[PDB]
Design a protein around this ligand. Structure first.
Ligand SMILES: CCCCCCCCCCCCCCCCCC(=O)OC[C@H](COP(=O)([O-])OCC(O)COP(=O)([O-])OC[C@@H](COC(=O)CCCCCCCCCCCCCCCCC)OC(=O)CCCCCCCCCCCCCCCCC)OC(=O)CCCCCCCCCCCCCCCCC
Ligand SMILES: CCCCCCCC/C=C\CCCCCCCC(=O)OC[C@H](COP(=O)(O)OCCN)OC(=O)CCCCCCC/C=C\CCCCCCCC
Ligand SMILES: CCCCCCCC/C=C\CCCCCCCC(=O)OC[C@H](COP(=O)(O)OCCN)OC(=O)CCCCCCC/C=C\CCCCCCCC
Ligand code: HEC
Ligand code: HEM
Ligand code: HEM
Ligand SMILES: CCCCCCCCCCCC(=O)OC[C@H](COP(=O)(O)OCC[N+](C)(C)C)OC(=O)CCCCCCCCCCC
Ligand SMILES: C/C=C(C)/C=C/C=C/[C@H](OC)[C@@H](C)[C@@H](OC)[C@@H](C)CCc1oc2c(O)c(OC)cc(OC)c2c(=O)c1C
Ligand code: FES
Lengths: 101, 49, 241, 79, 49, 59, 379, 67, 48
């Protein structure tokens, strides 16, 4: 129930990738599926993700983080890739099942 | 050819011929009083009595 | 048994990272080794020349050297033969082989003292405590015939009899030959014997630290300098409107 | 061999930097530096310290316990 | 010799306990200490090997 | 202005810079080595054969 | 043409890997060990050659030749120290290098990681035979034990031991082949290191955030050349401090006693960098198990890549993984401690726990917590 | 004729708090072991605790008196 | 080395024993003579 729902919010703050200004999706490791997804992203979304990342890298080299006031809020995190990624994986699974057929 | 060259080279690693094979060793059971153990050099590694 | 007494920590004048050896005391220790210990202990890795410029003058060393007859040869007829010592010779082995040594010590084999302090945990602290720490066995402890009690020695029953006691010799420098005074000098000697570089090793360490400081600093400034370009770097996302 | 030029597609990002000679190598050592050193320290000490602090104890216990078992139990000779 | 919990021997390398017969009683060791070929050819003088 | 003079006359030209480092080490070496030993020998007075020496020397 | 830095068949390489090499703008100090490791290798090889010039591979002369090196050869003592201590800083550095890799998921670069494992394994064997060269009590018995490990192999085994010794017991034939083997391996290491970096350059360095850094790369020079030099100087201080001030600190004093084929010292402990494994092997009270455990304790590194379940690459944003990680580090620190202690209670049981602990955090907890964390991210 | 500062200080040290209690603990052991015939105990432990405390003290100033 | 080339193992052993060899040291660190073993090398007529 609303258990892991608050658990999640806890973890989200514990992980801390938002102190860098990243969304959950930004931190995704770029395997094949993700790279394919990133490709389908509308340009604005893609250009934005880039900047977020480039800024985070700059923050990391600097050994700093965003002011608490700019950290992304658990409920304002946009899973801009999540769906695309779903499809990509969905698409692949089909081909796979089909080729073993 | 290969099998033989490997064979030879592989065996160049094994023990050489100067690696003898020596005899016994006598020991006076009087040098070893009751309740005691004594080590003697022998065929390389120790030898207990 | 399964219990052992670890020695204490004496404040040797050379214990400190920048503290050299007291060469005077090392000179003394030598005498102790020469006139007392050498009778059963070999110091195979040291030669009379090693003393020169450390504890003795060249002449003194040459002298000490000649006091020993050395076996050389073969000669013209292929004969071995004796000859005086050269500063190039090493300290004389009291026995021609362990079997002989053991034979002359109840089967007990006196180890070579060249690297003794480093061959034993505790070093001079241990060697010192042992030399002076001789005493009678506690209740219930029987020391086998031939072995002497010493709580500091592992097993407490060592094969060496108390090598030193007051005035067992006379330091030609006028130092009061008390037993512990002796132990302190010979131990100090055994340290130098195990590592003559000791002093230079430390003098280098000093220079090393200084340079390492000066240099690590200058390089921290240099690394930072170049990196500033990136540390203060500011960026912004100005998409088209 | 050469990688600089392919890497990735980026748009609309401006950056500003100054020559190393126009700025300070180590600036705001107090107003900024240390404050973050602490920030960082603070945020990780509760993740790191625990397992180590833990093992630390395990050391002391096991050590002391091993040593205790050295000492003799008078109850063995009160006979 | 004379160590361990079986009045035999103790190997200081990985804790193998041997008895007075040289048999493996405790520890990782797989077999009992090897026995050589010998013969008591004297009153108080034995010969091994 | 040393920094200006130094820069202007040593650090600017890649050559003069190099020569300055060579020259530098040279002076630095002497200075450092002497002082270092000084510091060491001081911290160890009367313990070095340097110190004991004279007692078995000549006259 | 234009510049001779990008065209020349050789410079094109130095420039291609140490000057124009693109590197993430955010790699931290945990990325300095790669080069320190490289520098160690060079330093070892160099002081080694220097020492090998005065060594004598012969049971009757080995020990004393080393002594002569230290006592008669100008600065021989220093060189031997740097060589002895270098070995340690080699392991110190390699261990941190391995850590960094696990924490930041560098192992996802399979070929780079795998070769890395080969490097560790080779470094291990190298350091082993090398230690056998002064031929002191530890040298001899270590030789005896380690080579004997292979007797654990069914049927063959022993036959392999014969080779290792060139006889039916450790002796001169062993010493001389070991000196050769020790002289050789360093170079096979340097060689493999080239393959390591080659596979690495295919992908380029990974970074703390575990996300693509293509949006921000920087020329290796002067950023990391400068950072690396600084790093070297930092590692150099302790290494030299130790070397010049406390030479035998990290070394056993039991090895100042010439090998005695008839007497194994009552207190015999493996070089510190081997303790953790030593500990794991003592835990299994069975010959073969202990060996397999030993083998596994290191070979397991090959599995790490197939145990990555996280949807994120590093542990920077995985607090649970982070704790499990530091737990593992302390787990080893514990195993090392145990290794230095006698096979007795409570030590024995603690060891067995830590051991059991170790394989579990790697084979079970990590992949599990990673899966768990993914769900917590709503993935 | 002479006096080894080692003895001089070993005495002074045995006056010490710990030594005294250790020395006492030892005497006690010695006593019952030296008496009780066909026993199994030893006084190594006590001797060590004593020695340990004593010499630790000894080694703290002995050198001041030595050259 | 003779064995299986020019002589039988026995013959070689025999030839071997015909020579006194110096061994040791012993229990007192003494050198001493002993018969030859097939493992010994042919006897040097002079010590140098
Ligand atoms: C010099 C030590 C750095 C001082 C410091 O804490 O900087 C804080 C501060 C900089 O603050 P910052 O901008 O937030 O830090 C940026 C980096 O941490 C600035 O640090 P960095 O990235 O430039 O350098 C980090 C460096 C520093 O490493 C340390 O943290 C120490 O570590 C390395 O370079 C790696 C080499 C590790 C060698 C260890 C060898 C193992 C042997 C083990 C025995 O500097 C000062 O306050 C001035 C200090 C003078
Ligand atoms: C008697 C005394 C001993 C004599 C010593 C011999 C003299 C040696 C001459 C060296 C000549 C140096 C000339 C350098 C000129 C190169 C150059 O262009 O500048 C330096 C150039 C960078 O350019 P900039 O300084 O930014 O600007 C240029 C100014 N127009 O190179 C650098 O980055 C210099 C950094 C040097 C430090 C790096 C090495 C530190 C290493 C650490 C460990 C050290 C100790 C162990 C070493 C022993 C090796 C076995
Ligand atoms: C094997 C036998 C070796 C015996 C043990 C030797 C180990 C010595 C003690 C441990 C040394 C580590 C020192 C603690 C450093 C503390 C620290 O800074 O940790 C926090 C810091 C923060 O990370 P971020 O989340 O990315 O930060 C960005 C946001 N600000 O984490 C790290 O530094 C990353 C991890 C560093 C690796 C250190 C691991 C030490 C070595 C252990 C070996 C383990 C691997 C397995 C070996 C198998 C053989
Ligand atoms: C009469 C011969 C003799 C003399 C002289 C003598 N020792 Fe020994 N020493 C031995 C014997 C025998 C042993 C071996 C004891 C054993 O291992 O059971 C020994 C052992 C030692 C050991 C320690 C062995 C160990 O395992 O801890 C040291 C250290 C030592 N002696 C130092 C000295 C010093 C220093 C001197 C001179 C002050 C000296 N000895 C004089 C015979 C002697
Ligand atoms: C002689 C031994 C070794 C040397 C000299 C060496 C050197 C290097 C160098 C120079 C780097 C690049 C800089 C860095 O990231 O540190 C590197 C990277 C790497 N090494 Fe090694 N290495 C060695 C052994 C190993 C070992 C034992 C492992 C792990 C089993 C390993 C795994 C890796 C990986 C995964 C990377 C990727 C770094 C990243 O995350 O970007 N290396 N190594
Ligand atoms: C992988 C790099 C190397 C490592 C890890 C290494 C490690 C070691 C170790 C641990 C020892 C024993 C040190 C001691 O005395 O306590 C040793 C000894 C020695 N090594 Fe190496 N070594 C390396 C490279 C080399 C090379 C390439 C040579 C020369 C071709 C060399 C020559 C020697 C010599 C002569 C000794 C024996 C004498 C001595 O102990 O100083 N080593 N080495
Ligand atoms: C091209 C020609 C190669 C022919 C080799 C071959 O096959 O020649 C056969 C021989 C093997 O002699 P054998 O069978 O062990 O003699 C039996 C004697 N007994 C019964 C007394 C034990 O190999 C060699 O040693 C040739 C060495 C080749 C060197 C390789 C280069 C590196
Ligand atoms: C000819 C070349 C050969 C045969 C090479 C063999 C290489 C084998 C392995 O390297 C891959 C091996 C070094 C590595 O095992 C993974 C180590 C961690 C094993 C560590 C190790 O050290 C000991 C040691 O040092 C000792 O002396 C001080 C004594 C020892 O017990 C009594 C040991 C011991 O019990 C173990 C397990
Ligand atoms: S070699 Fe004896 S316990 Fe392992």
């Amino acid at each position: 129930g609303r258990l892991m729902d608050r658990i999640r919010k806890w973890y989200y703050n514990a992980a801390g990738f938002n102190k860098y200004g990243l969304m959950r999706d930004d931190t995704l490791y770029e395997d094949d599926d993700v790279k394919e997804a990133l490709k389908r992203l509308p340009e604005d979304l893609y250009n934005e993700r880039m900047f977020r990342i480039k800024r985070a890298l700059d923050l990391s080299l600097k050994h700093r983080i965003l002011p608490k006031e700019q950290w992304v809020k658990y409920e304002e995190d946009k899973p801009y890739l999540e769906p695309y990624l779903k499809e990509v994986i969905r698409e692949r699974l089909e081909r796979e099942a089909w080729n073993k057929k | 050819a290969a099998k033989n060259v490997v064979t030879q080279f592989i065996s160049s690693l094994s023990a050489s011929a100067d690696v003898l094979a020596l005899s016994k060793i006598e020991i006076k059971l009087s040098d070893i009083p009751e309740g005691k153990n004594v080590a003697f050099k022998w065929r390389g590694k120790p030898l207990f009595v | 048994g399964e219990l052992e007494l670890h020695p204490p920590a004496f404040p040797w004048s050379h214990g400190g990272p920048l503290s050299a050896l007291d060469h005077s005391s090392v000179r003394r220790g030598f005498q102790v080794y020469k006139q007392v210990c050498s009778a059963c202990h070999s110091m195979d890795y040291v030669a009379f020349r090693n003393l020169i410029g450390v504890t003795h003058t060249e002449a003194e060393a040459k002298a000490l050297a000649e006091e020993v007859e050395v076996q050389d040869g073969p000669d013209e007829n292929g004969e071995l033969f004796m000859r005086p010592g050269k500063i190039s010779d090493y300290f004389p082995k009291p026995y021609p082989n362990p079997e002989a040594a053991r034979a002359a010590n109840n089967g007990a084999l006196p180890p070579d003292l060249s690297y003794i302090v480093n061959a034993r945990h505790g070093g001079e602290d241990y060697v010192f405590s042992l030399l002076t720490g001789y005493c009678d066995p506690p209740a219930g402890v029987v020391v086998r015939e031939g072995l002497h009690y010493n709580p500091y020695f592992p097993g407490q029953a060592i094969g060496m009899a108390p090598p030193i006691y007051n005035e067992i010799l006379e330091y030609d420098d006028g130092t009061p030959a008390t037993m512990s005074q002796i132990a302190k000098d010979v131990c100090t000697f055994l340290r130098w014997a195990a590592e003559p570089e000791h002093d230079q090793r430390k003098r280098m360490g000093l220079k090393m630290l200084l340079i390492s400081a000066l240099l690590t600093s200058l390089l921290y400034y240099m690394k930072r300098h170049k990196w500033s370009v990136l540390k203060s770097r500011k960026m912004a996302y100005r998409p088209p409107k | 061999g050469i990688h600089f030029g392919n890497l990735a597609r980026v748009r609309h990002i401006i950056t500003y930097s100054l020559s190393p000679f126009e700025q300070r190598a180590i600036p705001n050592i107090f107003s900024d530096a240390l404050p973050n050193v602490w920030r960082r320290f603070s945020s990780q000490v509760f993740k790191v310290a625990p397992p180590f602090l833990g093992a630390y104890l395990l050391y002391s216990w096991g050590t002391q316990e091993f040593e205790r078992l050295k000492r003799k139990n008078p109850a063995d000779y009160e006979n | 010799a004379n160590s361990g919990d079986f009045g035999g021997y103790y190997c200081p390398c990985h804790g193998s306990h041997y008895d007075a017969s040289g048999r493996i009683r405790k520890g990782p060791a797989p077999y009992n200490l090897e026995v050589p070929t010998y013969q008591f050819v004297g009153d108080d003088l034995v010969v091994v090997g | 202005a040393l920094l200006r003079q130094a820069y202007s006359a040593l650090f600017r030209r890649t050559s003069t810079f190099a020569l300055t480092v060579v020259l530098g080490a040279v002076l630095f070496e002497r200075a450092f080595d002497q002082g270092a030993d000084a510091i060491f020998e001081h911290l160890n007075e009367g313990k070095l054969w340097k110190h004991i020496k004279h007692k078995y020397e000549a006259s | 043409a234009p510049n001779i830095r990008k065209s020349h068949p050789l410079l094109k390489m130095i420039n291609n890997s140490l000057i124009d090499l693109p590197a993430p703008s955010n790699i931290s100090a945990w990325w300095n060990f790669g080069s320190l490791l490289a520098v160690c290798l060079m330093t070892q090889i160099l002081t080694g050659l220097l020492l090998a010039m005065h060594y004598t591979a012969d049971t009757s002369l080995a020990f004393s030749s080393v002594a002569h090196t230290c006592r008669n050869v100008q600065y021989g003592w220093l060189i031997r120290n740097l060589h002895a201590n270098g070995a340690s800083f080699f392991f110190i550095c390699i261990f941190l290098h391995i850590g960094r890799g696990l924490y930041y998921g560098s192992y996802l670069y399979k070929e780079t990681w795998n070769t890395g494992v080969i490097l560790l394994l080779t470094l291990m064997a190298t350091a082993f035979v090398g230690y056998v060269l002064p031929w002191g009590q530890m040298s001899f018995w270590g030789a005896t034990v380690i080579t004997n490990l292979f007797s654990a192999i069914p049927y063959i085994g022993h036959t392999l031991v014969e080779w290792a010794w060139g006889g039916f017991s450790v002796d001169n034939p062993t010493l001389t082949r070991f000196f050769a083997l020790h002289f050789l391996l360093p170079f096979a290491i340097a060689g493999i290191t080239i393959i390591h970096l080659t596979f690495l350059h295919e992908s380029g360095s990974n970074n703390p955030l575990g996300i693509s850094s293509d949006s921000d790369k920087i020329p290796f020079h002067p950023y990391y050349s400068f950072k690396d030099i600084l790093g070297l100087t930092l590692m150099l201080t302790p290494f030299l401090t130790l070397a010049l001030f406390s030479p035998n600190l990290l070394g056993d004093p039991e090895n100042f006693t010439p090998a005695n084929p008839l007497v194994t010292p009552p207190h015999i402990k493996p070089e510190w960098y081997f303790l953790f494994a030593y500990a794991i092997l003592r835990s299994i009270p069975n010959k073969l198990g202990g060996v397999l455990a030993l083998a596994a304790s290191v070979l397991i590194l090959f599995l790490i890549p197939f145990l990555h379940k996280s949807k994120q690459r590093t542990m920077t944003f995985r607090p649970l993984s982070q704790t499990l990680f530091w737990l593992l580090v302390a787990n080893l620190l514990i195993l090392t401690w145990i290794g230095s202690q006698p096979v007795e209670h409570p030590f024995i049981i603690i060891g067995q726990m830590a051991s059991l602990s170790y394989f579990t955090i790697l084979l079970i907890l990590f992949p599990t917590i990673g899966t768990l964390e993914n769900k917590m991210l709503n993935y | 004729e002479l006096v080894d500062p080692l003895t001089t200080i070993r005495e002074h040290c045995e006056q010490t708090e710990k030594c005294v209690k250790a020395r006492e603990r030892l005497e006690l052991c010695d006593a019952r072991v030296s008496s009780r015939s066909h026993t199994e105990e030893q006084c190594t432990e006590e001797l060590f605790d004593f020695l340990h405390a004593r010499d630790h003290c000894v080694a703290h100033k002995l050198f001041n008196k030595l050259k």
